[model samples]
Target: SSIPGPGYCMGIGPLISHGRFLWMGIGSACNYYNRVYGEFMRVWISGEETLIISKSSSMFHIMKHNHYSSRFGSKLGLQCIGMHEKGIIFNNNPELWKTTRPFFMKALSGPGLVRMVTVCAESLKTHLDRLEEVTNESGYVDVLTLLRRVMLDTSNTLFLRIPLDESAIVVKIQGYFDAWQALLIKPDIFFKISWLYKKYEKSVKDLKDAIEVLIAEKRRRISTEEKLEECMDFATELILAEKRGDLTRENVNQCILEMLIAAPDTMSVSLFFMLFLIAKHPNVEEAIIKEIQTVIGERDIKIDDIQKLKVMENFIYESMRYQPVVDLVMRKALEDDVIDGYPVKKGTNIILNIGRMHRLEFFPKPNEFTLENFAKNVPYRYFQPFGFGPRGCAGKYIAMVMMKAILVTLLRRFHVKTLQGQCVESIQKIHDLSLHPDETKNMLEMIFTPRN
Candidate 1:
């Protein structure tokens, strides 16, 4: 197959250029970027040759063959941060992935999702109450900011069974996110330099230290109290694994930190966008409220209740298509092969623009947010909210339950509506590690008034 695209950029090429534009949530950026090359394109990203796969067929093909690997983690300082390959997110080795994926899934499965739903619903009660109080006093609350706090609380509490302080931990992890974006922007220099690693080392250490502190606290409590009745969190499960000698100290640490990295921020992105979408469309909110009332009947949400809320489930699916948190995914070819008749070398990076894939001609009203579109079984290539193939996200089911539970809890209590003057033009999409809005912009402002 013939590959058609830019020859080369000694630096970061169109990959970085389009990435910067795409980060701003520019739809056309991907359109033009992918259009320049048919299904696949070749270019240099950070002085390295790369292939970008945009078409769903191609994405499916490559992902299925995923012995896909990348050093992007090390390049991003994940190892320095103690977030090594032990975590499912960064681990690509087939044997290691086979080992860890099942373990991580088991850790989050069975009672894990039910417990998360219970915790999320309960936390939403307090969080919604606080939001109502704040909205009443301030006229509107930033749902993004509010949801971030709510998820942080929920995730930490779900994992540790104790709410950790947010301020200091936020500062620590905030640095990681900040540094992550900076490194992406300046990949060449940052990846090549050593001192830059030193600059980010503290925040990484602070975050790692925070997880250790939480683990120590849990261990102390478990030691002092015999037969303590408690729901298992990821941290507790990992601790138990360590005791069984199934995991190492580093593995346990990486698992706990990975859970922290995985849970709150990504959930907040989905929740924020979900609420924003629901708030803008009154009919959608009304439909969700009706489903909530009809199913749960003025009671707190439970895991069983999630299955009954088909309308809410559709709403969540639609919201993700409207604004996916993970807009792009990358993998490196494990061996030399031919794709679409084009020769691919071993170690060629394959970037899939999921945002672009979601809008392909295959889906009805491709860019339009229609809940009915998901009523039928959407093709796997077209609909991958939790990712696709073997390396797909293990927490997807739990995430769906968590999002639905929170929405049910909130909608049952309050009618969600965008603030006056809120419009499609007001919110500017900003993509970092996840797709979200500019927090500085008031476009995400929404009012959560108590239902009579």
Candidate 2:
């Protein structure tokens, strides 16, 4: 039962640990803990003693073990949103997860993936065309906003069959996300403050109302339209599940909303970071463009072309390692278990510190950001940007394809450059539900010149 952690005053054990590195952000704090306490450490987060695991072997063990299958579902924000036992991300109920996970798997693979490619390409083209037109003669564009638009459009079209031309739903979703983060990051007592709680509740209600409308529209469409043999997207799959009586109407609404919420942020952040990296590293950008031209010159990118762009893939993998979007993955133990020879009790929250793990010694020059890390063969155990094991991200393949397609089309059409006085190192990193650049400091503006 022995675990290592920083000493703290009675009733507030290591509470100051989080605040110690406040300016540097949470990822830096975790990295400090990982370095000082080795692979496994016990720390108090929001008055709960939590286990933080940064070692890859332990991470893989926890992932592969059935005891760590469920996510932490006791968050106040999750309860407010009715996500403690519903949807895939925060749903800890194995039974409901069993029922819901397959539909997502079905919708994100095969036909779903094929549909995603088309949707992503069309959306990217349209957005980029607008981007080109909006570039203020300096060839500079707000690439993060462009990526967000692409993500919002592609995800909405692919999942809900809804084109978001004039909706402020994304802004509302971001509000909801921010509130959820605040509730989760702060102590449970924050939920007791009436104004804060009301705002969180209102954001949740607004999102739910929007999603409910979308669901009702989809239901009407389902009743009026002909049934196809293939499932095209997540919304369609949920609607069909509702028709089959396997899930309630509420279940359909919650599931679709979860997918919509999960779909955009991570992909957009990763894409933005990768594009920033490409712009900062011109040699890497040239290599990527060369690979894209060699593999798919003067032709629209196909699903098959993604596999052929090995250099581009390696660059992406390396960039993910360098600056991972997801900082950590959380799992709550279902039963007593031993991890890395330490006895862990049931219900202990286990944090797989992916952000710290990516900087571990498994990769050469782990501290440095270089493509050489993925230029040769790298160990698979240490690299899990999309997570691992039974409850891993279902949109893994879909995300990879979408990223490759967008990058391919983008590079094929334009030569990207970093704006003067801007570099990847200069961009301030902010730790949120995902690791992203601080938009206030840097909007990831890049100059893009169209290719002939």
State how far residue 103 of model 2 sits from its true place (Å).
1.3
Residues 1-452 of candidate 1 have per-residue lDDT tens digits of 57777644655465665454435433334445577766567755554566666777677776677555442433455555544466667665556556666667876678777788898888778876665534546677767656666677777777666558764665566666655444443444555677656677767677878768877888787667656555555677667778887777787777777776666568876787777677667877777777776888867677788789888888888788767777777677778887766888787776777777777746777667778677787777667667756777778788888888887777777777787766443577665556666666665677777888
State residue 176's C-alpha deviation in candidate 1, in Å. Answer: 2.8
Decoy 2 TM-score against native = 0.93
The C-alpha RMSD of each candidate to the native structure, in angstroms, is: 3.3, 2.3
**Candidate 2 collision pairs:** none
Single out the weakest 10-residue window by summed lDDT for candidate 1: 20-29
Q: What is the C-alpha local distance difference test score of candidate 1?
A: 0.68
lDDT of each: 0.68, 0.77
Question: Candidate 1, clashing residue pairs?
Answer: 1-341, 1-342
Candidate 2 residues lying further than 4 Å off, grouped into runs, are: 14-26, 132-139, 228-232
